[PDB]
Every structure is written in structure tokens, then in C-alpha cells.
Design a protein around this ligand. Structure first.
Ligand SMILES: COc1cccc(CNC2CCCC2)c1O
Lengths: 300, 237
């Protein structure tokens, strides 16, 4: 179990730790979050009580260093930082725990939700999508645009998701135009899995990371990426059977975690209806289709 | 974006463009089988690719052999159209290639776009105009070369004959669409109008009769009558 201490909480903010959230009042004696499960990436995220504009946060893995949060009154936000002095850190954390100034990561024993949402997400891949090499953790916010969005403007602050474009020379083999557009297996299996991602685990990891940025930060380009990666699989006639089974599990937990009030903006009607009811894989996503039909029958 | 009444004179500017109509590519007769089921039999078709400024028509004849052994022919027809238009463009010298292609049916947009990915600077556009190019097969000489073809073939026509010597391309296109709209609404009466007078002939190298300027005004008036009529006969007005 690891800890992310806070120097202080000078501004009233709503703090999220993965799917959990709690409110901290202005100058409330809050010094961080303890009992964070080891073995998973995590995301700490914030919304100022004053300006709900700009939900922002940090992806991290406690195995990679000792991290803390400190408010910067100049830049006006809670910043993640690494403490290199491990004895200063343990000493800091021990004092805050002794004074019980920390919230406990509130995981139910039965509950595999976070594992299931982050199964294939790796910090090393997050850091290649979010490029800030000097830090071990990655900042994301609501407003950050993707490389592909930038092609249709500060490159330093972009989400470098893998570009997917169904009407592109990468996607369409000369002389296989109709074949490759109507059945995207070539593009999925050769171009993307074999060529770019190397394996389906890396593909699923980017798909899961995109959903989580889309859900927690309302990041529109992330939602576009998540739906494109779903649609590329569903529009492929030839997909390894283990991939379809895993995709069904992935999407199931995403839809179940998806709060109902954010569904209208986070779910693309066309992709989902095509995927569940028209695509090659219309009969391959039993768990996802069941939860979609019982939780969001209006979208369909 | 979409071509409509608002941007209609764009058709006659000096940016090369082509209309593509696919409505006669896949043509069938439906008939009963000996067992009393229904079956289709394909007949020859054609892609109607037209430069509205110059009148140049690239008639790509679609022979029935192209459908042998194929499934989902209506879908294939759009992709075959797009394959043939892309081949046409690649065959033209760079300075003759179009700067836009306007498809008369929106279902041709994605097939054409995918086949033209090599030409990112050629704009593929739909239109809101209800153009009557389906009636091209009511032009006897075009119908004749399509039905006689024994293999795939491209035939080049000027659908305006020599009209551009005397009228603008705006006026010529307006005459063409009036003639074709008439042939589409009532083919027999339209053809009677055009041929009734034995003394007006069709030159060997032309598609329509050699009307004087005055006779075209009479003809054009008779076609409007026809269309407005049938529009009553149809809706009872
Ligand atoms: C239940 O999972 C969620 C999905 C979207 C948004 C939130 C809450 N975001 C908080 C964290 C920072 C202040 C607002 C969730 O908890």
C-alpha cells in the first residue's frame, strides 16, 4: 500500500482518486491519500470549486517513485511532484498518518473495477502518449487535443494517440479498396496489431487509457480515439477469438462504470448501434450488448 | 460542400469538373423462374461521366460479364463505378484532370473518396439538384452502343452536339436537363416531340436533331408543356 501526501489544501477542490471522489474545503487540514493499491496505474484528478472549467489530473504508478501534491498559487493548480529524498518522504508520510490527516483509498475487497478498467494500461505507454520525459507521472486535462485533432496547436501539450483513419492510404491497400473499406481486418491485424501496436495488449491499453481520459476529464479527442478503436475491431471480419472475448469484458466494465448522466455526451450513437447490431461482430459482444440494452436503451 | 441552386453557376466556370451518375451501371430485368420464383437477369449498363462546361461525355460501358459470380451487386456497382472513374482520371493528362467530381447520389461519396485517395486535391462533392441523368439511356444512340457492347468499352461523346457554337454552356446545360427531364417523365411524348418533323434530321456525328434557333425555342416550349402536363396528369391539377 502506497501514499500520495499533500503539502496542504489551500483552495476548495473536488479530488478524484480513480473512480472515487471526495470534497476538500478551502484550507481544510488535508494531507493526502493512503492505502493506494500497488500493482496498478492510478489517476489523481481535481476540479476547483470555483472554476469547474478544466478537470485535470496526473497518471502515476507508485512503484516508479515517491510522489506528492502541492498547490502552486502562481499557476493556480495542484501539482504532482517527485520527492527524491526517500527518508524525508517516509518521515513526512509517517507524521501525516500518525495525525490521521489522510483519506484511505476506499476499495471494497470484492471489487475488481479498477483492475478491470486498467488491465492493459502501462505507465510506460502513457508516457509515450503524454510526452513530458522529465517527470515519471503524466498530466492530462479536459482541453488537451490529440495529434489527429491537430491535423484537422502546441505539440508539447498534445495526446499522441495512434492515428486511426478509415479513409486513408494506411487503411486501404491499392487495388483492395472496396474489400479493405468494408472489412477492416487488414488494417486491424497487419497495419495496427502486427505493425504499430505489436500485440493486442498494447492496443487494449491505449483503448482503456483513452476511455478513462474521456470519462474522468471529458476529453473529447480521447472519446474519439476510444470509439475509433472499438469500431476498428467491430468492422473487422477476422479478429482473434481471444481478442473479441477480452474486448467484450473491457467494454462491459467501461459501460458499467460510465455514470448515466455523462452517457449522452460520452457515447457515440452511430458507433454503438453499428457495433452491436450491424457489424461483423454484432453477435460477439454478449456482455456489452446486455448491459448497454439494460442501461442505455435510448441511445439504441 | 454540396452543390445546389445557390452555387449553380459554378458549373460553368473554368475549373474542370465532372458529374458522375451511377444510376444505369447495374441494370436488371426481373422475371419468373420455371418454379415460380423470381430472378433477375442483368443487362449492359453504363457510367455517365459528364463535363458540364464542355459537354464532353465519357460513357463507360458496363458489360454484364463484370457481375458474373459476384454477390451484393448493388453495392458492388457503386465501387465498380468509383474504380472506373478513378481509372479515367489517372488516364487523363494532369492538366485535364478535374478539380472536383460531383456525384449525383450520396451513396457514391465514400466509394469514390476511397478510390481517389491518391488525389487529395480533387474534391468529391454531392449535390442537392435532382438531375435527370438516369434518362441518358433514352437517347437512342447512347442506348444503342450500350446494348450492342460485347466487352467493356469507353465511348466519348459531346452531349451538346454543336450547340456551344451558338449558346453558352449555362444555356446548353439548361437545354440538356430540360430534354432529359422530359424524356424521364414521359419518354414516348418526348421522343415524339423531337422527331415528329421528318425534315429535321440527326447528323451522323450528333445525338439530337439539327434544330434552328427558332425550332429549339419551339421544342423547348413543347418540353416544358409536357413536363407541367404530366405533373398534372400525375398529381391531378
Ligand atoms: C465515477 O467516475 C467518475 C466519472 C467521471 C467523473 C468523476 C468525478 N470527477 C471528480 C474528480 C475531481 C473533481 C470531479 C467520477 O468519479
Amino acid at each position: 500500500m502506497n501514499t500520495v501526501p499533500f503539502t496542504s489544501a489551500p483552495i476548495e477542490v473536488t479530488i478524484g482518486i480513480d473512480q472515487y471522489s471526495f470534497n476538500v474545503k478551502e484550507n481544510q487540514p488535508f494531507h493526502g491519500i493512503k492505502d493506494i493499491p500497488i500493482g496498478h496505474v492510478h489517476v489523481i484528478h481535481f476540479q476547483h470549486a470555483d472554476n469547474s472549467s478544466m478537470r485535470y489530473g496526473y497518471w502515476f504508478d507508485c512503484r516508479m517513485g515517491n510522489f506528492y501534491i502541492q498547490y502552486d498559487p502562481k499557476d493556480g493548480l495542484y501539482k504532482m511532484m517527485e520527492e527524491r529524498d526517500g527518508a524525508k518522504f517516509e518521515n513526512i508520510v509517517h507524521n501525516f498518518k500518525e495525525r490521521q490527516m489522510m483519506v484511505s483509498y476506499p476499495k471494497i475487497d470484492e471489487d475488481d473495477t479498477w483492475y478491470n478498467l486498467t488491465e492493459f494500461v502501462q505507465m510506460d505507454k502513457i508516457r509515450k502518449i503524454v510526452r513530458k520525459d522529465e517527470n515519471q507521472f503524466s498530466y492530462v486535462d479536459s482541453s488537451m487535443t490529440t495529434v489527429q485533432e491537430n491535423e484537422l496547436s502546441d505539440p508539447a501539450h498534445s495526446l499522441n494517440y495512434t492515428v486511426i483513419n478509415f479513409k486513408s492510404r494506411e487503411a486501404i491497400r491499392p487495388g483492395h479498396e472496396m474489400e479493405d473499406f468494408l472489412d477492416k481486418s487488414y488494417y486491424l491485424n497487419t497495419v495496427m496489431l502486427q505493425g504499430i501496436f505489436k500485440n493486442s495488449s498494447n492496443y487494449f491499453g491505449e483503448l482503456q487509457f483513452a476511455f478513462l481520459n474521456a470519462m474522468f476529464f471529458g476529453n473529447y479527442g480521447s472519446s474519439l480515439q476510444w470509439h475509433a478503436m472499438i469500431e476498428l475491431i467491430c468492422s473487422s471480419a477476422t479478429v482473434p477469438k481471444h481478442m473479441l472475448d477480452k474486448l467484450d469484458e473491457i467494454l462491459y466494465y467501461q459501460i458499467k462504470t460510465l455514470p448515466e448522466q455523462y452517457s449522452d455526451i460520452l457515447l457515440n450513437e452511430r458507433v454503438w448501434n453499428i457495433c452491436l447490431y450491424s457489424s461483423f461482430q454484432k453477435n460477439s459482444l454478449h456482455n456489452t450488448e446486455k448491459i448497454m440494452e439494460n442501461k442505455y436503451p435510448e441511445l439504441l | 460542400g454540396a452543390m445546389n441552386s445557390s452555387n449553380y453557376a459554378e458549373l460553368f466556370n473554368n475549373d474542370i469538373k465532372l458529374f458522375v451518375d451511377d444510376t444505369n451501371v447495374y441494370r436488371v430485368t426481373v422475371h419468373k423462374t420455371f418454379e415460380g420464383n423470381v430472378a433477375t437477369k442483368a443487362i449492359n449498363g453504363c457510367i455517365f461521366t459528364l463535363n458540364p462546361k464542355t459537354g464532353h461525355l465519357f460513357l463507360k460501358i458496363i458489360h454484364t460479364s463484370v457481375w458474373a459470380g459476384q454477390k451484393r451487386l448493388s453495392q458492388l456497382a457503386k465501387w465498380k463505378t468509383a474504380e472506373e472513374v478513378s481509372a479515367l482520371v489517372r488516364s487523363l493528362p494532369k492538366e485535364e484532370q478535374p478539380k472536383q467530381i460531383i456525384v449525383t447520389r450520396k451513396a457514391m461519396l465514400d466509394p469514390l473518396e476511397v478510390h481517389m485517395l491518391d488525389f487529395p486535391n480533387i474534391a468529391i462533392r454531392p449535390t442537392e439538384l435532382r438531375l435527370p441523368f438516369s434518362a441518358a439511356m433514352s437517347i437512342d444512340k447512347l442506348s444503342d452502343v450500350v446494348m450492342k457492347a460485347t466487352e467493356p468499352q469507353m465511348v466519348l461523346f459531346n452531349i451538346y452536339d454543336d450547340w456551344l457554337d451558338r449558346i453558352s454552356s449555362y444555356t446548353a446545360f439548361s437545354r440538356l436537363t430540360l430534354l432529359l427531364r422530359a424524356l424521364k417523365t414521359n419518354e414516348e411524348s418526348a421522343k415524339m416531340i423531337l422527331l415528329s418533323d421528318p425534315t429535321i434530321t440527326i447528323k451522323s456525328y450528333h445525338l439530337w436533331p439539327s434544330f434552328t434557333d427558332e425550332q429549339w425555342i419551339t421544342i423547348e416550349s413543347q418540353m416544358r408543356d409536357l413536363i407541367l402536363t404530366e405533373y398534372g396528369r400525375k398529381y391531378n391539377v
